[PDB]
Design a protein around this nucleic acid. Structure first.
Ligand SMILES: [Co+2]
Ligand SMILES: [Mg+2]
Ligand code: NA
Length: 358
DNA sequence: AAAA
């Protein structure tokens, strides 16, 4: 029996139901834009469960026993089986608001509010936005427009590895015992991504050393002429606070959102313009004792993380977030040195990172 | 808005 929870399913990158899930993902994204959280969640859970199937749906009978497939979703599946297309997803792809919101938020520094603002001002193209003489842009948006073509092109694995080398070389310069781990999609086996994410932790660093590392590393890159954009968010981490009860938990660790200048020479690929590429990089610094919780949170996918936290609360009376695991019955925080220990605390079979593509 |  297929579980309703992504944390009790193995979801690998061989999706046999891309025809259905691409349509469901479009409908979920449109519901996010239309602020319909409930309908968004229903399409996300249906898309997630189909992604886990070891075979393609080729008839309605194949959906028997699959959870998270309501009547609305089953009508969409039926329509795709009928002529290989989703009329519902096709209408979203041709909607002017949907097209504008996708296009505008593809700019680094542009979220839902700015995209809505520009749409209601009558803008439909990035060319008209960039060349407007009345619009005022944030420093994040200026970087987003300046490096747009590089940021919209997918980061591949040779580039992600080249970035890992740069991160490790910079980090060990100030903290030689630091452990740097690539997280996100690349850790789940993806060939491409919009960015490269890293978790940094040090077993011997002090509270002050931990705080100063991201400042030291970015100043070093600024001196090297590699820092194209930098925003450091200070830690709001609380050592003894209970984990988040929220559906989508906030991360309180010190982090930075960067744009790095990646020289082509540092990339060992099969394959060149200006000779460098702008790469979005995120760095997270966490206390050594919380490294397993942070790794599990930053590895994703977003759906796998939502279901882990939902399962912990509803099935185990536990509270899980990127910083800790709390047992409400035993009234104790549960320690973990690895992700495997977190899964064992939760009574779950271990799900490999490449199996968390929910 | 930056976030898996
Ligand atoms: Co990221
Ligand atoms: Mg990522
Ligand atoms: Na954006």
């Amino acid at each position: 029996k297929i579980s309703q929870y992504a944390c009790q399913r193995r979801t690998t990158l061989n999706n046999y139901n891309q025809l259905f899930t691409d349509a469901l993902d479009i409908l979920a994204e449109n519901d996010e834009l239309r602020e319909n959280e409930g309908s968004c969640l229903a399409f996300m859970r249906a898309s997630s469960v189909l992604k886990s199937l070891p075979f393609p749906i080729t008839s309605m009978k194949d959906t028997e026993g699959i959870p998270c497939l309501g009547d609305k979703v089953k009508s969409i599946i039926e329509g795709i089986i009928e002529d290989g297309e989703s009329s519902e997803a096709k209408a979203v792809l041709n909607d002017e608001r949907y097209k504008s919101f996708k296009l505008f938020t593809s700019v680094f520094g542009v979220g839902l509010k700015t995209a809505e603002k520009w749409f209601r001002m009558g803008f439909r193209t990035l060319s008209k936005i960039q060349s407007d003489k009345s619009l005022r842009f944030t420093q994040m948006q200026k970087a987003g427009f300046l490096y747009y073509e590089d940021l919209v092109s997918c980061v591949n694995r040779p580039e992600a590895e080249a970035v890992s080398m740069l991160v490790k070389e910079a980090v060990v310069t100030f903290l030689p015992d630091a452990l740097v781990t690539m997280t996100g999609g690349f850790r789940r086996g993806k060939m491409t991504g919009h960015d490269v994410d890293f978790l940094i932790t040090s077993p011997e660093a002090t509270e002050d050393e931990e705080q100063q590392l991201l400042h030291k590393v970015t100043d070093f890159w600024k001196q090297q002429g590699l820092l194209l954009y930098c925003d450091i968010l200070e830690s709001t981490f609380e050592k003894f606070k209970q984990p988040s009860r929220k559906v989508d938990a906030l991360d309180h660790f010190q982090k930075c959102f960067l744009i790095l200048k990646l020289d082509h020479g540092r990339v060992h690929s099969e394959k060149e313009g200006k000779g460098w590429k702008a790469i979005r990089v995120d760095l997270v610094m966490c206390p050594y004792d919380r490294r397993a919780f942070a790794l599990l949170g930053w590895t994703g996918s977003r759906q796998f993380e939502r279901d882990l936290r939902r399962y912990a609360t509803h099935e185990r009376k536990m509270m899980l977030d990127n910083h800790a695991l709390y047992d409400r019955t035993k009234r104790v925080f549960l320690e973990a040195e690895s992700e495997e220990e977190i899964f064992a605390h939760l009574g779950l079979d271990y799900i490999e990172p490449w199996e968390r593509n929910a």
